[PDB]
Each structure stands twice: as C-alpha cells, then as structure tokens.
Amino acid sequence: NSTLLPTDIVGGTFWLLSMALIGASIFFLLERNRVDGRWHTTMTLLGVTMLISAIFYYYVQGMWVDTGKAPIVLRYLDWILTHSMQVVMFYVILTAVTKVSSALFWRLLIGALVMVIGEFLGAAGYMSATLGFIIGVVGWLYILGEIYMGEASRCNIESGNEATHMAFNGLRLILTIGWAIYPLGYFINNLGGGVDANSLNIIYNLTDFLNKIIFGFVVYRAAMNDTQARLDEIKK
Amino acid sequence: NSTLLPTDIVGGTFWLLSMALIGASIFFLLERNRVDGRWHTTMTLLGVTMLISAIFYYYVQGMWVDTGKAPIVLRYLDWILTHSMQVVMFYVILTAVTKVSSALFWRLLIGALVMVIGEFLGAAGYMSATLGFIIGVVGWLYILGEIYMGEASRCNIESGNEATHMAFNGLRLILTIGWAIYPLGYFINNLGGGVDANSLNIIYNLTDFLNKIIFGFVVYRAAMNDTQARLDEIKK
Amino acid sequence: NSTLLPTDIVGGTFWLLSMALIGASIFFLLERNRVDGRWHTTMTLLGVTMLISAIFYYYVQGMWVDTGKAPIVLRYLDWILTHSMQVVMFYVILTAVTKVSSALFWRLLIGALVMVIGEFLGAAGYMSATLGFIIGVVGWLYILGEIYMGEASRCNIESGNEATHMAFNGLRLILTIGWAIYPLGYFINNLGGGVDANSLNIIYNLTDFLNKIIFGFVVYRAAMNDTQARLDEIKK
Amino acid sequence: NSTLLPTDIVGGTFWLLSMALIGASIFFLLERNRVDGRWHTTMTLLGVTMLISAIFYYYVQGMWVDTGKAPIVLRYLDWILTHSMQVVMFYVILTAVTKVSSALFWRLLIGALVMVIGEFLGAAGYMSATLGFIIGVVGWLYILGEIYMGEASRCNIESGNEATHMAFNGLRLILTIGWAIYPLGYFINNLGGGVDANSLNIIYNLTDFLNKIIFGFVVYRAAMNDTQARLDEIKK
Amino acid sequence: NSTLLPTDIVGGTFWLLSMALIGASIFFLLERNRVDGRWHTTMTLLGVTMLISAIFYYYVQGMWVDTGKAPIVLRYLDWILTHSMQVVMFYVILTAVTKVSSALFWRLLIGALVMVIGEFLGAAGYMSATLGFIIGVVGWLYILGEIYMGEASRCNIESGNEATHMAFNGLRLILTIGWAIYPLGYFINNLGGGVDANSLNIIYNLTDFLNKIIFGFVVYRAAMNDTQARLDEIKK
C-alpha cells in the first residue's frame, strides 16, 4: 500500500488515546464498588486521573483536526494534573493499608510539581532549557528516592500487605522506566538535536499506554487482589 | 423511488452503529447490578467495550460528515482496543466460574494484538500487504486454537457451568464465522482485486451488529442465566 | 402575528423531541431502582429505547440546522432500533410476571424487522414502493396477530397480573392505532399523491409523543403498579 | 466603564441559566437517594425538569452564538414540557403523602397544556393573538382554581403533612406571582405596544431563577423536611 | 526556546481549569457515598459547585478559541453562582454537625450576592466603577464579619466537632486571603491604572486553583475526617 503519513498517525493516536482513556476511566469507576471500602479513594483517584487525561486528548484532537498543529508544550497541561495524581497514588495506596505520615503526601506532590513545572519553564522559554531539564530531572530523581529509599519505601516493606508489595514494585518500575521517556523527550526536543513534533506526539501518545493505562491496571489489580484476600481470610 | 446512494448508506450506518452501541453499552452497564457479583467485571468489560466502539463511530461519523472520506485503515483504532477486549472476555468469563491460569489472559491478548497489529502494518504500508495478511490470519487461527483445542477450551469443559458452556460455544462461533469477515475484508481490499471503500464501510458497519452486539448479548445471557441458576438452587 | 413557517416548526419539533426523550430516558432509568427487581430489565430497556431515540433526534437536528434537509428515509435508522425494542417489550414484560416461550421473543423481533426493513427497501429504491408497503404492512399485521390472538395474548390472559393486563391493553392500542401512522406515512409519501417532507417530519415528530413517550409511561405505570401491589400484599 | 449592550446580557444570561439549571438538576438527582422513598418520584421529576430546561438553554445559546437571534416563540418548546412538569408536581407531591384522585393529574396537565398551547397558537400566527392570550390566561386561572379552591387544595389541607403544607403554599405563590410574568410577556410582546426581544429574553431568563429554581428548592426542602420528620418520630 | 505568548497561556489555562474542575467535581461526587449521610449535602454542593465552574470554563474556552477574546465581565456569570455556593457552604457544614439558625443561610447568601452583583454593576457600566468596588468590598467584609465574629463563628466554636474546627479555619483563610484577589482584580482593572485582560485572565484562572479547588479539598477532608472519627468512636 502507500505508507500512512506521520500526520495520519498523529491524529489517529489522539483518537486511540481518547478512547482507551475514557474506557479505562469508566471501568475503574464502575469497579470502584466491588473493591473493599479501603480502596474506594484509590479507585476514584485512578478513574478520575484517566478521565482528565481523556479530556486532554479530546481537546488536543480538536486542535489538531482544526489546525494540524499539536504543540508539545501542550503536554504540560495534562502532566501538571495527571503526573501529580499518579505520584500521590503511592501515598493513597499506602494509606489504604497502613499508617503513613501525611508529610509524605506533600513530599510526593512537590516533587511531581517541581518536575512538571521546571520542564514547562524551559519548554515555554521562561528559563534556560538546560535549567528546566536539570530541575525536571531533579524533581524526578527525588520522587524515585522517595519510593526506592524513603518513607514510602519503608511503609511499603512494613505494611505486610502482599497486594501493595506488588503494586509498589510495579508502579515504581513504570516510574523508573516508563517515565524516563519524559526527560528524554525534553532532552531531545529542546537541549539536543531536536525532534519532529509529529514523531514526538506519536511517542508521547503511545507511551501513555504504559505510563497511564498499565499504571492503572496495576493499581486495579492490587485493590482487587486485596479485596479478595480479605474475603478468603473471612472464610477461615 | 430513486435509489439511495452508497454514500448515503455509509453515513447512516455510522449513525445506526453509534446509536446501537451507546444503547448496548448503557444497557450492559445498568444490568451490571442485577447479575451476581462474580459477573460484575464481565459486565463492566462488556459495556465498556460497547462504549469504546460507540466513541469510535462518533469520531468516524464526524470525519465523514466533514470530509466524505472514512478510510478503512481507521478501523484498526477500534479493533486494537475492542478486538482485544473481546478476546480476553473468554478469560474473564472463565475466571467468573472456575480457576484458570493467568497465562491464558496473555496468550489470548497477544493473539489479538498480533492479529490487529499485523493487519495494520500491511494496511498502512509499513510491510507487505501479503505479510500483514499472513500475520493477521496467524494471530486469528491462534486465538481459535486457544478456544477450540487449548486451555480455555478445557477450562470450559471442566467448569461444569451450563451458562458458560453456552457462552463459550456462541462466542466461539462468532469468532470462527463472524470474525472471518476481517481477514476477508483485508484480503480483498489489499491483496485482491480491491473493493470500493463505501462498500467495505457498509460491510464493516453491518457486521459490528454480529461481531459486537450479538457478542454482547451472548455474554449478557450467560451472566443472567447463571445469576438465576444460583438463585433457583438457593431456593432448594 | 406572522405565521411560523413549517420549516420553523420542523426544526423546533426536533428540539422538542430531543428534550422530551432525554427527559423520559433519565426518568425511566432513575426510577429503575424503585420498582421490583422483576421489572429492572423492562425499565432499562425502556430508558435505553428513549435514549436511542433522543440520540437520533440530536443527529437529525444537526443535519437540519446545517442543511435544512431532513429526509424521511432517515427515520428507518431510528425505527430499525426502537421499533424492535418496543415490540420485544411485550415479551420482556411477560417474562417479568409469567413463563413464556423464548420463541415468542423471536417471532416478535422478526415481525418488527420485517416491518421496518421492508418499508426501508421500498423507500430507498431497492424494491418497488408497492412491495415495501405490502411487506411493511404484513410485518405489522403479524405483530398484531401475535398480541391480539397469539401466544403473547394468551400468556397475558393467563398471567393473572392486573398490571400487565393494563400494560398489554394499552401498548396494544398504541400499536394498533398509534403505529398506523407509519403505514400511512409510507403509503402517502411513496405510493400515493406524495406529501411535503416538512409536513411529514412534523407529523412523525408529533406522533413520537404517543408512539414513544405514552408507550413508555404505560410500561412505567405497570412496573410501578405491580411493585406496589406486591408491597400491599406483603403487609397482609 | 462602557455599558454592556443588551445583546451581551442576552447571551450571558443564556449561559447563566444553562449552568444554574444543570447544577440544580444534578443536585436534585443526587439528593434523590437521601429522601424517603415516598419522595423519589418527586425528586426525579424535579431533577429531570431542570435538565430539560438546561438542554433548552444549551440549544438556545448555540442559536444565539451562531445567529444573534433568539426568537421568543422558541420559549414554547421549553414551556410545553417544563410548565406541564411543574403543574403536575402538585399531584406528585400529594401522592407522596396522601390519597388523591388520579383525575387530578389530568385536570392539572390539561390546564398546563391549554395555557401553553393557546399562547403558542397566538404567538405563531395560527390564531388571533387576542385569542391566544385569553386561552392562555384561562388555562392559568384554571390551574389556580385547582390549587386554591379545588381538590389539590383540599387534599393539601386534609393531608396533615406539614412539609406539604409549606410546599403547596410556596409553589402556589410562585405560580400566582412568578408565573404572572408569562401572560404579561405575551400581552406586551403581542397584544400591546410590543417589546424588544433582547429585553424580553433577559426578563424570561432572569425569571427562570424564580419560576424554575426557587420552585425546585421549595420541593426539595419539603422532601428533606419530611424525610427528617419521619426519622425524628421513629426516634420516639 | 521562544517564549510562549500570554495569549497561548490564556487559552491553555482555560483548558487546565476545565480539566481540573471536571476532575474535582467527579471525585467529590463519587466520594459522596463514603462519607456519613450527615455530609451528603455538603459533598453534593461541593461537586456541583466544581461542575458549574467547569461548564463556565468550557463556555469560555470556546469563546476564546473562536474569537481570541475572553472579557473579564464574563467572570460574573461564574461568580454569581459559585461564590454564592461557596459562602453558603459555611452554613451547610454547620448544619451537618450542630444546630444553626436558618437566618444564617440568608445573611451569608445576601452578602455573596451583594459582593458579586455590586462589582458586576460597576464592571458593566451600570453604576460608577468606584461604587461597585465599595459595594463589592462591603459585601465581602460582611461575609468576613459573619465568619470571624458572627453566628457562624460562634456555632463553629460551640460545635465541638474538630473536623469543622479545621474546615472553618481553612475556608476562612481562603476567603480572607484567596478571595482578596477579586477586589484587587476589580480595583486595578477598573478603578486603577488598568490591566491587560490576558494577564488578568491568567491570574483569575490560576487563582481558581486555590479559591475553588483547595477550598473543595478542605471541605472533603472535613467530611472524611469526621466520618472516620465517628467510626473510630463506634469501635470504642
């Protein structure tokens, strides 16, 4: 056949994302009633995260259909909200099953905001692109230190919940690996050679499968797993 | 009268599909509360599948109204999501009533992804149309081997659930026969003489009655049947 | 004043219908939880019927606003779905309160499909307008024989439910009288002198008050009546 | 500053109305679950009334944004539905707490339909504006006689419910005073000097605060009051 | 990079606000079921406030996308509704946990309406900008006197609820500090030098994070805190 053009792929992946995310949202929000009540905030936050994301992709697809332009800087609108919601999920899931300092919520949320807002300043010309990279990468390595070596990590080890053991590990691996895409997108788009925006929209669209959807399913399986482990122990 | 033009049929069948699918979705999601809880994920997945599908048809009808073009390659956006959701339904329904290796979920989902992604590469010019056919047909014969001769089949026979006996058979017959349309659409559109896109949009629209809606109703009757069989046995 | 033009009435009645139907839908779907559970499918089907209908009217009003044309042939999109849903309601309501052969569901649904699809072929030029009339009229007299002289009738008499006695009679009278509009619309528009499309859009819009909304309220009162009769007998 | 133009006010009040009404709707529909079940139809009808109204204002604001015209005759689309729903509320609230002839429902609904349909005929040029006034005013004085001197009045006095005593009085005062706006709008716009349509749109928009929203809150407080009085008496 | 233009920021912050607010709304409305029933009106009012706000931002973003203009006077549409809903929250939260005169509801709501309507008259040219400032500032200092030195304050001290102690303080600090933005916006835009509308849209958008969202979360934590304190005391 005649190859599809990246412009055709850019637009279709906005629809794909839009659909998958509204799907994930509704699923997470209808399955909110079948998990224990200890899991209800986790599931609401999950499902709302997917919805915000979906509304972004709806806004973006219309911009694209109308104009044929979808700047990369627009991605910070989504990430200011949804990357914050995803980081704070670590706290929410821990408060479902153990006791944890509320300080942790704030540590986590600040790191997320630093990581998005720093990269947004370099991207939008308000400060050097070099500096917004460094700040974005610092705000991310902080979040990693929280979850690998900090309170969230310890709380996790000392929870005793085997559902949370698995969520923490899986969510952490997505943030460690999945979320590496964001510093690297930035590095190339800004500090490096540069990258076609079409290419980078495709990349950012296709990685929101991992970074948002698999992230969701991991949370969902924890809530489901746990709900059931509590039922299986009631039987005994 | 003066015959309707296929262009008129193409556009109306997008509306028809849109309506039927939002209908099916809402029905499946409101009837989610009247089935046993063992059936709740099945019903949520069902209803969300219908919703994704509906949102596609909404996206497509607007493209059509605006442009009068509805490429066939756009169908892979729907199928990447909804054909995967339908294949994994076999697993979901089995996990409602029996114990099944989680491996099966992945076998099933990979086959679906191979079958859609392979046919999408040949369709969009990234690899030979011949090869995307072969791969799509392989990804489909795999799914069939799963459900006719593989674990899903055995799990089904050894479940003992008579609701699931009936779902499996009916869902299997739709995949065996209903889903033959997709390899054959592809074969003709790409590897064969060729086919008017209007004609093929009509065909793909009218077969989503079977492939999506009757598929849904089959799942719904199983969940309903079973819910009731459990109530009828509680009375004794 | 200066008379409104039928074009002004055509467009306003699309809005009226749209509003009334989304209203009816939401009401039927929120009152689904206050009827017995034996009535839940009836109420979901009712409310979904109204919703499909509403989405049609939304699609049509946009076509009208944009183009000032609203072909009559577009009505078959609605009727293929909603006339089938309304005919099968007879079965659904009977299965709420008595035992009935599942065959009846199919008898009923085939008649509905014959009646819509036959008149759609004559309307869209695929077969003689004469023949599509005859077939549409045959598919309708069949449905009437079902409900006046056939199993549905007997099941109704032998149910003993006084709520269903009333629904059956009222729904039957709407199909006997209300639905006469459809053969006659067809006869005039196609086989007869002809009729302004504006006039006929107005007529079809204003009769969806009877044919859809009063039809709904009749079903709703049965479910409500019965739910209450069961509560009043529990008190004794 | 430089005065806002009435055109600017007309358009903003459509948005204001739209927002307030979708707000009221959702509130009434979520608070439907916290009132006694005897109040559930009242609350569903309330919330659906607000929703129909909101959908009107959405339809109208788009017409305005596109065209800069919002005829007054368009108001009869809303009023044919929502004035009927509001009049029949008297019956619904009485059937929540006492026994009342079903005849009353019909008396009430006919008066509403006469009052809207008569004024719509004079407005749209089908009969003399004089006569449509007289008929609209007759259909309104009838409704008033029902609720001041007729069965609804008696049923209210003989109910004994103090929540309903208060609703009836408040709803009656809105219909007596609030709804006087409609005959007077009509009189001036048609039978009298005439009135700028911008002015009259503003007036009709700002009076739907009373006539729809305060009307709603009155119903809501009755349902709430009563629900609570029944709980306070259960404690004793 | 090349700096983003304030026009680019104005449009993106409308989307940001839109997304965050629909997010907050849905979260507050799904978490309505996990708080005590004493908190249900608070949570419904909260979530509906967020929704009205979101619908505004949707209306505004379309105006902007179409026209590139977003007058500041449009903000009074939102504030007439949502500032009233936020002020009356003080009453709603007090009626959740203590007994309070219904008079307070009205004191509070009048202050809110005076504060918005006065500033809207000066803004839209109907009265001197000076006078609309004074009135807006008076309507605000009144609300502050209510909540710092008036009944609401006393009711709060005499409630004994420690969740409400915290909400009152936090909501009060947002109104004292957060809401200072509104008098000062007005002062500068109208009575003072003047201010770019782009700048002021950015400022008003970014302060609806505090003034609406943090306001919400404060209410949500009170309802959550309390619900739990009541569960923890039931255990003892």
Ligand SMILES: CCCCCCCCCCCCCCCCCCCC
């Ligand atoms: C028991 C202690 C509390 C547990 C649950 C806490 C629930 C909070 C969940 C909502 C957090 C949302 C954070 C969204 C960040 C958006 C920030 C945008 C700034 C521009």
Ligand SMILES: CCCCCCCCCCCCCCCCCCCC
């Ligand atoms: C042990 C019980 C487990 C039940 C698992 C429920 C998971 C259902 C949701 C699965 C959806 C998977 C298909 C998602 C479609 C998109 C995948 C690839 C897109 C590129």
Ligand SMILES: CCCCCCCCCCCCCCCCCCCC
């Ligand atoms: C046995 C208990 C009752 C179960 C019946 C469930 C009925 C579900 C609704 C049936 C749907 C009717 C068919 C609507 C679509 C018609 C097919 C369109 C073909 C183009």
Ligand SMILES: CCCCCCCCCCCCCCCCCCCC
């Ligand atoms: C127990 C006493 C009752 C407590 C609950 C009262 C519920 C009130 C909730 C609604 C208040 C909204 C009032 C502001 C709406 C905007 C008014 C705009 C006027 C132009």
